Amino acid sequence: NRLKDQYLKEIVPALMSKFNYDSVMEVPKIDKIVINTGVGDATANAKVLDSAVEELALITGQKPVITKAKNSIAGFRLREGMPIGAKVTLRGERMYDFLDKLVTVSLPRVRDFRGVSKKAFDGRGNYTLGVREQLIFPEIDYDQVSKVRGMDVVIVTTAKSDEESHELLTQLGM
Amino acid sequence: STSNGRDSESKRLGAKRADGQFVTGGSILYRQRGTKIYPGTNVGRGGDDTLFAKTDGVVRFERMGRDKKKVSVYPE
Amino acid sequence: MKTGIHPEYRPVVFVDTSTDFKFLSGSTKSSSETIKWEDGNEYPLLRVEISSDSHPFYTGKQKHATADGRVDRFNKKYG
Amino acid sequence: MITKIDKNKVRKKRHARVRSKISGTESRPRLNVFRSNKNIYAQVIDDVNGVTLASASNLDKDFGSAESKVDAASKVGELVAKRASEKGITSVTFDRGGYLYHGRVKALAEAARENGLEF
Amino acid sequence: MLVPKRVKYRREFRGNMRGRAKGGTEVAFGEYGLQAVEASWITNRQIEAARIAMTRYMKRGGKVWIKIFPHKSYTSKPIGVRMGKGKGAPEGWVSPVKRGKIMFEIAGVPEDVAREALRLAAHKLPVKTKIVKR
Amino acid sequence: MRVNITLECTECGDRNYITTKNKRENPERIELKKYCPRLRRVTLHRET
RNA sequence: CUGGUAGUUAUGGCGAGAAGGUCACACCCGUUCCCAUCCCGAACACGGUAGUUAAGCUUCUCUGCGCCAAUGGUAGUUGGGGGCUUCCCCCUGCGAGAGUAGGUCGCUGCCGGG
RNA sequence: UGGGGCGGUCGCCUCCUAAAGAGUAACGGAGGCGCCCAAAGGUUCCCUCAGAAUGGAUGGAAAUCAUUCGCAGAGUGUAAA
RNA sequence: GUCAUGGAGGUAGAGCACUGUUUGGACUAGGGGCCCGGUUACCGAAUUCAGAUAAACUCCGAAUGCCAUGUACUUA
Ligand SMILES: [Mg+2]
Ligand SMILES: [Mg+2]
Ligand SMILES: [Mg+2]
Ligand SMILES: [Mg+2]
Ligand SMILES: [Mg+2]
Ligand SMILES: [Mg+2]
Ligand SMILES: [Mg+2]
Ligand SMILES: [Mg+2]
Ligand SMILES: [Mg+2]
Ligand SMILES: [Zn+2]
């Protein structure tokens, strides 16, 4: 909750008199956070998919929606409509609180904590993080862990290019 | 020898009434697959995409925008 | 916010046992505790390991280690 | 960088989808509704000649209604109903306008029906 | 020999060769050309023979352009076979050449050798030709 | 597989309609509300 | 001047550059209420005007892409007549496609406010 | 039935031949049918495809997400128009 | 029968905007070698410049023929 307050009270003036924006709404902000998982290995056993589903529901606060395959690639022993993956979309208070938790207590848990990648930008102002260990987030426990598997947290920002997104993220604390 | 040799029979498609002709209601004006001619005013599209007159009048083959046509019937 | 299909998300207050660093951010896990902070935030006192205030990349960790000189060590060891 | 679409354009697309069946005539003109953040507008149109037979809005002479901007919709509906009835219009088709028949649009439609307009 | 790598349909109509060449009447790549004066079918074997004769004379100097390709295929029947019972089996590839078409171009050699190489090539083709400049 | 079926009125017992169904996906008798000519109203028709 | 709503084959579209305003329209703030998300007040819906023209919108300039488009000539061809007949030629009438001169950053109707 | 026999074919649908209305033959050139769907039908409401580029992965060229370009390069139970 | 007017329909021709076939040039993302990833031409997919081709290709498109209207002029 607070992180939004500091964003709109101190980071906003900094972006103002750092980028010389014409009007107020030209300052970039964070639009949504989308988290994705892949269960392509759950082609036969459909229960590990479910386990990951309650994992995501527990870890975010909202139940994910199960995603279905759009093709029937034979290389991956696939048929169209097979349920693969899940996603949770954060928009508003949940987004800010989750990002605050991620930056202040989740990141200082990776086994080799040297710093997030400085070249993980899609080229248009959106950052994609690639944590690949389950209980990097403190909420879930080691005993409840049934299969170590990664995650894809994606941050979507209104900035029009990479660099100002970089400074916005550093201002937030990434 | 000659694995070919089969063909269907022709369905007599085309236009059955001319532009400017007085037409009785309910009579077919254009037989066709799909929609080559759209139904205009006072004409309707049938089950197999034929166009028929919904009232007595004078046939007029008109033009919609750049690349489409339509047929309509105008009472005299 | 569809009802009856979401897990509980009651607020919680974080505390860092490493350096007594208070923090407030609601979490799904109940953790079976109770503590009120900042003019009233009665919620679980969720303990945690090191936070960003002590991690290497997330804080100003200075050395936590040393270096080598080899030829210096050879000169020091041999004499 | 996200493309925030203009809601009015997709509203235009839905309105065009609606209008493929509704087209007011001389005998049965079309009642059209446009909704803005502030207020509501209503118009009666025949499409054979493309003229507005009657109209009403929230910026009329009296236009006295403020409770929750939905009694405003009811007042607009009743006022346009009276104005259209004065000109001799009694049978119309309600053009939805691309919105949903749920809130202010629904209230305006019911207010119009409460008076001498037949849908 | 030039043969298409793939064909949609195996059998084709023979066609006709009325009128002037639709395109290619004017030399564009090289500065010497061999222009057809009348219309005829040119097979790929004749094209190969003409190209070999043209290239050997120049001692593999200069450049050669072939402006035609045998797209069309023709069929034939064996001996002792009556008329009927389907169409024959394909045998070769042809390029129907209309009059006024330029089918060979040469660059990088002087007048004498270019003219003599074109003259040598023209004797391998079943069509009357003439030499043109750019 | 696909077979022909008959639908009779429950009130009258008159076989009023014929249709088709798949014995595999629809192994049960089919219930449909159709219009009965004799009574001149909609009744419930069950497969025989 | 603006908001709404129609007609017209893009000469009306796409792109680039500039300006303006809460009078209208917008972005905008919030989810108790009607309503809603295979999750998310993003959207739909509802409730308000703190802030801003950054975007939509509106106006202004262009030929960059696109679209329209001549005149002349040519291909083809109905009718008549000849050759040396894979085809070719002559007379009369019709007459393209491509290329180009050039045009285009729209034109009209109704209603309400200013 | 380019003599008869041997071989092949015999009913229906789609395209070319077919000569810019309809029709038009050959043991001419290519393919399909003798079903399927209780929703793959009716109606109301809503929206938009293929592919490529970049970002991270257990997971690779190709599985699931994020932004951009994208007039149909997809789809339309099944052959072609 | 002719004249004037209005239509439907994609042949001849032409064209490359889609689909197949195809030539030369630059770059080719690469593969194999001579190698210490370079050299790549021994082949190079996509892109692009230019130039061709089509009964079952079409952004275009005639002459005739066909269907009608007329109160026009002849004619059975
Ligand atoms: Mg047929
Ligand atoms: Mg139908
Ligand atoms: Mg049917
Ligand atoms: Mg022209
Ligand atoms: Mg025909
Ligand atoms: Mg004909
Ligand atoms: Mg068969
Ligand atoms: Mg369907
Ligand atoms: Mg041709
Ligand atoms: Zn009965």
Side-chain angles (χ1 to χ4, degrees), chain A residues 1-67 69 71-78 81 83-110 115 119-140 149-174, chain B, chain C residues 1-9 11-24 26 40 44 47-51 56 60 65 67 69-70 74 79, chain D residues 1-59 64 66 68-119, chain E, chain F:
Chain A
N1 190 8
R2 65 179 177 88
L3 191 146
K4 182 174 71 68
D5 300 302
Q6 290 85 19
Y7 151 73
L8 61 86
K9 293 182 183 293
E10 293 82 3
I11 297 89
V12 165
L15 298 154
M16 265 303 192
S17 50
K18 184 178 184 293
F19 286 106
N20 297 322
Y21 283 142
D22 264 9
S23 59
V24 182
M25 283 74 74
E26 184 178 1
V27 54
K29 61 167 174 216
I30 44 168
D31 214 7
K32 67 188 179 182
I33 290 183
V34 170
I35 298 167
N36 189 27
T37 317
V39 300
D41 61 20
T43 42
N45 193 87
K47 300 289 94 176
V48 59
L49 162 60
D50 291 331
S51 81
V53 180
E54 292 84 4
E55 190 277 331
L56 293 175
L58 202 73
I59 191 167
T60 48
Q62 327 171 348
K63 66 182 290 294
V65 54
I66 294 92
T67 300
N71 296 115
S72 72
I73 289 303
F76 311 150
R77 74 281 190 191
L78 280 183
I84 307 167
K87 67 184 288 184
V88 173
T89 300
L90 290 96
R91 292 179 181 176
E93 294 293 328
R94 298 281 191 81
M95 182 179 72
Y96 271 102
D97 186 74
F98 166 80
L99 186 142
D100 180 11
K101 274 190 298 153
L102 170 84
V103 69
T104 198
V105 68
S106 165
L107 265 296
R109 179 169 290 230
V110 179
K119 181 67 174 66
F121 277 44
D122 63 358
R124 292 180 179 90
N126 307 312
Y127 181 67
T128 316
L129 190 151
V131 64
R132 297 292 181 184
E133 191 277 331
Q134 294 277 33
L135 72 164
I136 289 300
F137 316 91
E139 171 200 333
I140 63 170
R149 179 185 299 221
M151 258 169 61
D152 295 326
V153 61
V154 184
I155 310 163
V156 184
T157 66
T158 51
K160 277 74 69 177
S161 68
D162 291 331
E163 69 275 16
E164 69 275 16
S165 300
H166 181 74
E167 295 83 47
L168 166 67
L169 266 296
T170 56
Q171 284 310 307
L172 287 175
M174 185 64 72
Chain B
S1 298
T2 316
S3 187
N4 314 132
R6 323 155 293 269
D7 205 72
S8 159
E9 67 182 2
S10 307
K11 292 310 176 298
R12 277 83 168 161
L13 303 180
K16 308 306 183 183
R17 284 298 184 267
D19 176 302
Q21 194 176 11
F22 176 80
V23 67
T24 305
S27 63
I28 307 164
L29 311 177
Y30 203 81
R31 281 217 187 246
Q32 62 84 30
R33 303 296 98 190
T35 310
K36 308 179 61 169
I37 304 295
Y38 280 79
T41 303
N42 292 175
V43 309
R45 182 161 148 235
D48 57 341
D49 291 331
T50 79
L51 320 168
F52 58 92
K54 291 174 70 175
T55 184
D56 308 341
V58 170
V59 191
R60 291 294 173 198
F61 274 92
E62 293 179 353
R63 182 193 47 83
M64 293 183 286
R66 322 179 37 91
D67 291 336
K68 293 182 184 293
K69 287 167 165 174
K70 82 190 167 83
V71 63
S72 65
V73 161
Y74 300 113
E76 59 185 3
Chain C
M1 185 64 72
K2 270 205 203 146
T3 59
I5 62 170
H6 300 231
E8 194 195 9
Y9 193 39
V12 71
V13 295
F14 275 87
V15 64
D16 186 17
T17 77
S18 86
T19 179
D20 294 338
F21 163 71
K22 201 206 94 164
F23 172 60
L24 169 52
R47 322 286 290 173
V48 65
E49 300 86 7
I50 55 156
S51 80
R70 185 176 177 87
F74 180 84
Chain D
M1 183 278 288
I2 310 102
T3 302
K4 191 132 82 181
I5 62 175
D6 180 24
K7 308 175 187 182
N8 189 359
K9 284 194 175 294
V10 67
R11 178 202 150 280
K12 296 279 204 294
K13 278 279 290 186
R14 298 205 298 267
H15 184 58
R17 178 204 288 130
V18 160
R19 279 277 317 260
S20 81
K21 294 180 184 178
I22 297 169
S23 57
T25 61
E26 187 72 36
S27 303
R28 195 181 254 268
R30 160 178 68 95
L31 182 63
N32 192 10
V33 166
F34 161 70
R35 171 170 62 78
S36 62
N37 277 97
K38 299 289 94 175
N39 63 7
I40 193 66
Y41 313 79
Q43 274 182 180
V44 177
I45 297 89
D46 66 359
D47 291 334
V48 297
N49 290 318
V51 294
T52 291
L53 265 294
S55 178
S57 76
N58 212 13
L59 273 297
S68 165
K69 87 206 286 189
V70 170
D71 72 338
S74 282
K75 175 261 292 178
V76 165
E78 82 176 54
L79 188 153
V80 71
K82 281 161 179 283
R83 282 180 180 173
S85 69
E86 288 170 7
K87 261 86 164 176
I89 290 144
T90 176
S91 180
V92 290
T93 75
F94 183 78
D95 187 356
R96 192 174 71 197
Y99 310 119
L100 285 175
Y101 193 70
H102 167 72
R104 300 152 84 191
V105 177
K106 193 177 176 68
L108 191 149
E110 313 301 18
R113 266 170 184 153
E114 287 220 336
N115 309 320
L117 277 296
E118 299 179 355
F119 285 6
Chain E
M1 294 182 286
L2 317 180
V3 162
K5 299 172 186 57
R6 218 196 64 87
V7 285
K8 206 171 188 289
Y9 301 98
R10 266 168 79 232
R11 279 86 183 259
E12 196 155 332
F13 280 178
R14 290 156 172 104
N16 64 355
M17 294 182 286
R18 281 200 275 273
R20 292 264 298 176
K22 177 145 83 170
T25 309
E26 182 65 26
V27 56
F29 291 157
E31 69 275 16
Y32 290 100
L34 180 70
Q35 184 186 15
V37 187
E38 61 178 37
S40 199
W41 269 12
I42 310 281
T43 72
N44 51 1
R45 274 134 58 92
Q46 305 167 357
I47 294 174
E48 182 65 26
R51 184 201 60 82
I52 282 165
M54 185 180 288
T55 286
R56 196 159 38 202
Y57 183 61
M58 294 182 286
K59 280 73 176 175
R60 277 149 188 77
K63 219 189 184 168
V64 189
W65 284 271
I66 305 174
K67 312 292 294 316
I68 56 178
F69 197 87
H71 298 295
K72 199 186 289 289
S73 63
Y74 64 88
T75 54
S76 179
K77 266 193 202 295
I79 297 169
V81 170
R82 304 239 174 90
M83 308 274 111
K85 289 158 175 43
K87 198 156 150 63
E91 302 197 340
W93 306 84
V94 287
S95 160
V97 168
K98 294 184 180 187
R99 63 189 160 84
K101 179 82 159 181
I102 288 183
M103 42 201 177
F104 281 103
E105 296 195 22
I106 297 169
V109 285
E111 284 282 329
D112 310 319
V113 297
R115 286 200 172 262
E116 175 65 353
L118 286 169
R119 183 199 81 89
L120 277 184
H123 274 109
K124 262 85 190 166
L125 304 169
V127 57
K128 300 174 74 75
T129 56
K130 73 196 295 297
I131 318 296
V132 305
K133 291 177 70 68
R134 188 209 270 270
Chain F
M1 65 182 179
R2 182 65 60 84
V3 295
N4 291 302
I5 69 178
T6 55
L7 270 64
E8 66 182 1
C9 186
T10 48
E11 309 195 22
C12 305
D14 300 3
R15 293 95 173 279
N16 278 127
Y17 298 86
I18 67 170
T19 314
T20 50
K21 88 171 176 194
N22 208 4
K23 282 199 298 184
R24 172 161 57 78
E25 193 276 332
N26 298 290
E28 299 287 332
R29 282 165 170 253
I30 301 299
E31 316 276 337
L32 288 166
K33 291 174 70 175
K34 314 290 281 165
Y35 169 89
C36 187
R38 185 210 292 266
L39 308 174
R40 290 208 294 288
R41 65 188 136 100
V42 183
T43 71
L44 182 85
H45 289 62
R46 200 201 308 300
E47 178 183 357
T48 80

